[PDB]
Design a protein around this ligand. Structure first.
Ligand SMILES: [Zn+2]
Ligand SMILES: [Zn+2]
Lengths: 97, 103, 103, 97
């Protein structure tokens, strides 16, 4: 064969919950974000005030995108968020309407 | 740059524990090598992240019986360390398959 | 969430102009639909970018004869506008194929 | 067939030039970045001081990653850079050594 052939496994899990992501607001305590999103995987020193999440995004039975989310804290409350998951959840809810 | 005009790709979507794959991990493996062996973890950019985390399922009769976690660490682009109970659960499943060959 | 346990994927790597594909663009197409028709543009995250830019090549006898640019715009997740000389170059190639059928 | 089958085209072009990306330094004029990287595609008002680039990253004949680069300017000189391409070029040169 002139063209190669490979087998790739895409890990399933942590499907994006748009309502949970679109629920984050500045001023929420760390405990609030835990109740909304669950604990992140990393919990070292550098990630005490920076929590990383990664979600799977599926459409029509296919995993299409890994959507990342970062939550920043100061004095135990949420100060800002960034990542693809924010837009991913916003447009997912707007498409559901 | 030289590129294949086309290639074929079979995708598996799941998180079932693959004992033989986990048991084949070796120090010095590249990130490309680990990806083809264990699968693409739930990371936006695995190529440029030095720690990957997996959560595997062990199911029998269609029921998840236990969950196994695996963490792989990379330094200078090669594998150097592993953590998580997926390592021991994989070794126990391989040895259980051996004991069953001997009845 | 319901997922296919596995699916097959044939990948084409190139930037050759595909006249029929360009000529099949319609208003209202989703981003998933445009991706399967024209290809995945050189964008990190096309799903969440509202403008995509393509640069196509027209080659004959293995020599790039001209380059065609295409820009697609999305609003509310569907296609609404196109720019670039790939549109006219694709229409001219399709009509040239027709004229050749008539000798 | 129980499993679907799809055809996907991955667009070739704009291959990452690690030396060019690793050459960017604060204080370079816009003209310098043009000579190093060429012009970006977007050139509207919002992108007068923010230039976006995207590159293909290939290994062993396969396109593996689309690597993005953003260059920020103030008073016509480069102030900072961000994107995957920076790490992508750094580790590509370190692996070439
Ligand atoms: Zn990367
Ligand atoms: Zn996205």
């Amino acid at each position: 064969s002139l063209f190669p052939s490979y087998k790739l496994k895409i890990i399933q899990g942590n499907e994006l919950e748009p309502r949970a992501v679109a629920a984050l607001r500045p001023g929420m305590t760390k405990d609030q974000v835990l109740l909304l999103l669950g604990s992140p995987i990393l919990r070292d020193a550098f990630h005490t005030d920076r929590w990383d999440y990664t979600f799977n995004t599926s459409r029509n039975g296919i995993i299409k995108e890994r959507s990342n989310l970062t939550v920043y804290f100061e004095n135990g409350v949420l100060v800002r968020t960034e990542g693809d998951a924010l837009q991913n959840a916003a447009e997912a809810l707007r498409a559901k309407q």
